[PDB]
Structures are given as C-alpha cells and as structure tokens.
C-alpha cells in the first residue's frame, strides 16, 4: 500500500505494487 492513514507528501518503499 501507498497511504497507511493519509501520506499526501511521503510515498513509503512499496507503493504501487
């Protein structure tokens, strides 16, 4: 996943995928 609670400015290692 891309948001956990609401990341608008961060994208974790992993996000679309």
Same mark, same amino acid.
């Given at each position: 996943?891309?948001? *956990? #609670? !609401? #990341?608008? !400015?961060?994208?974790?290692?992993?996000? *679309?995928?």
């Amino acid at each position: 996943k891309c948001t *956990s #609670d !609401q #990341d608008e !400015q961060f994208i974790p290692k992993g996000c *679309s995928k």
